[PDB]
Amino acid sequence: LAVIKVVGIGGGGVNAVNRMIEQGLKGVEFIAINTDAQALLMSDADVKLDVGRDSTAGADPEVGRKAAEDAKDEIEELLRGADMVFVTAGEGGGTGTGGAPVVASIARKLGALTVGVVTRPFSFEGKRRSNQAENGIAALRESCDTLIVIPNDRLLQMGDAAVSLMDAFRSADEVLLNGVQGITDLITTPGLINVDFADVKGIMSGAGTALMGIGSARGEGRSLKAAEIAINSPLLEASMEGAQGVLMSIAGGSDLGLFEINEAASLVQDAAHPDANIIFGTVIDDSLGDEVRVTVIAAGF
Amino acid sequence: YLAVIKVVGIGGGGVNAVNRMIEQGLKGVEFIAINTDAQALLMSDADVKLDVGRADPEVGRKAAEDAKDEIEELLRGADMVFVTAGEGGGTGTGGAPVVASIARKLGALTVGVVTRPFSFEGKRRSNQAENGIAALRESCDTLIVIPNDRLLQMGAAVSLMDAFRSADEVLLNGVQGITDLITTPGLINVDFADVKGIMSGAGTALMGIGSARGEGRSLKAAEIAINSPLLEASMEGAQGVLMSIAGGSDLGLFEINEAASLVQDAAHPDANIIFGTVIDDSLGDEVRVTVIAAGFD
């Protein structure tokens, strides 16, 4: 069994990990890293590391980088043993922006399959945060096998138009969960089409920057509808058909049959780049009832 | 009247080890987490927590010494204290000998547990892995040394992630194999005074582990444990041996006694041998044998 560790670093990443835990993401070890002990006391993560205590990131990515570097041997000892490490953060602050590349580089040095899952900040958060996020993403990309970047701006095209600010950030938490769980559930709770760790590692190793799409549907033709929503997701930036590497997971209950799964795969193949490498896997989750959830990770544009 | 056993994890590696013990449900001991870094704190659900941080051995040593009164108060009343800085290194390497010294001056049977890193990890100057081991040895009654390199000889071809996971698991057993023998009823129970007799002032100890299922599982697991690469072919010369067999409540006396007879044959003729068993019905039909060997011929 592959050992998967999910790191949330900075306030946004720790909030995302708390949401993952609250929604019952299974089969992974949760690690919260932050510069604020009180926030960490309230987190339900398995492992909690308070860093940068001497300095305390004032949203300063350089302080976040130095706090993580100062703690690097400690982080390494926590990550040792993982086959796969997710590094999750909201980019644009100090602790996550500056610290996430340190965590990922430790995981990549150890040879764990290292997947970043991060948000770009909303435009309304201001240009300094956008610039910081841009620099942090560039740094993180060099240290991850795959770095999934979720543009928060595109979340506002989805969901409800009467959303509040707090609502918007909870949707960000949820999409970071979706990005992690859409991959890890393939490994931890496979359905009819088993895509195991070595397959995931084959397509995500050295893949570079990636985008994600998500779709959910119920009822008649649910699998086709969920796949069409996913591949047209605003989070994929109208770029699905340019991607040459695609990992797709289809989750449902035991009532989800191979015919439905296959028609979803056919729809996605028809839409994909002519030379795309596409891996399809399924997830058994009886808590979904009659919902089907499709997650697409797209890389190699 | 019952043995009071306190398990101290110091520094990031040691606190993480204690957290793993707690997560795995190690019973019958008090867990103590001591943080030695000013810059970072690994949180813990240990019973007792002390942050002395006010990544180097001298820093951790002075941090612990500065807090010696507080550490002593935490350890007072223990009959047995385990101290470990766990995997890796940092300030915990410097703090651990200070904790051990305080425990021993209180009169507790003081058992250190230290890992030698894998050779592929490289080495940080001053010879500080070996210097950390030497410092802890001078402050402990017994120092259990786990040579991680020997894990690459145990079982298929070990992967890097496997190697690290195995290291974590055997470190946990450096504590649990002994503490369960003392704290947890089995068919064959031991006297703490005999444990203290064999481990007081013993110095370096090595550990062996084995497991087996099916018929003859007790003998098979014991043979594996006494031949374990982690014992460095030292079993035949050992003058103090502790052996614990963990297994289901249905394990028979004859089968258990076969394992006890094997370790007696394998140890030095003049060895002290403490033998017992632990009921762990969650192992199913598997048995797990731990051997601790100290002294030379």
Ligand SMILES: Nc1nc2c(ncn2[C@@H]2O[C@H](COP(=O)(O)OP(=O)(O)O)[C@@H](O)[C@H]2O)c(=O)[nH]1
């Ligand atoms: N998913 C999520 N993102 C957040 C939350 N709060 C803020 N963010 C985003 O994360 C970015 C970094 O903020 P934060 O993680 O608090 O800063 P840090 O602790 O200094 O890394 C912000 O610019 C927001 O886009 C949250 O509760 N959840």
Ligand SMILES: O=c1cc(O)c2ccccc2o1
């Ligand atoms: O969760 C905590 C809180 C602390 O005060 C602490 C102190 C020392 C060591 C570990 C610790 O973990």
Ligand SMILES: O=c1cc(O)c2ccccc2o1
């Ligand atoms: O975690 C483990 C797994 C085993 O292989 C084992 C075997 C013998 C003794 C203790 C043991 O602890």
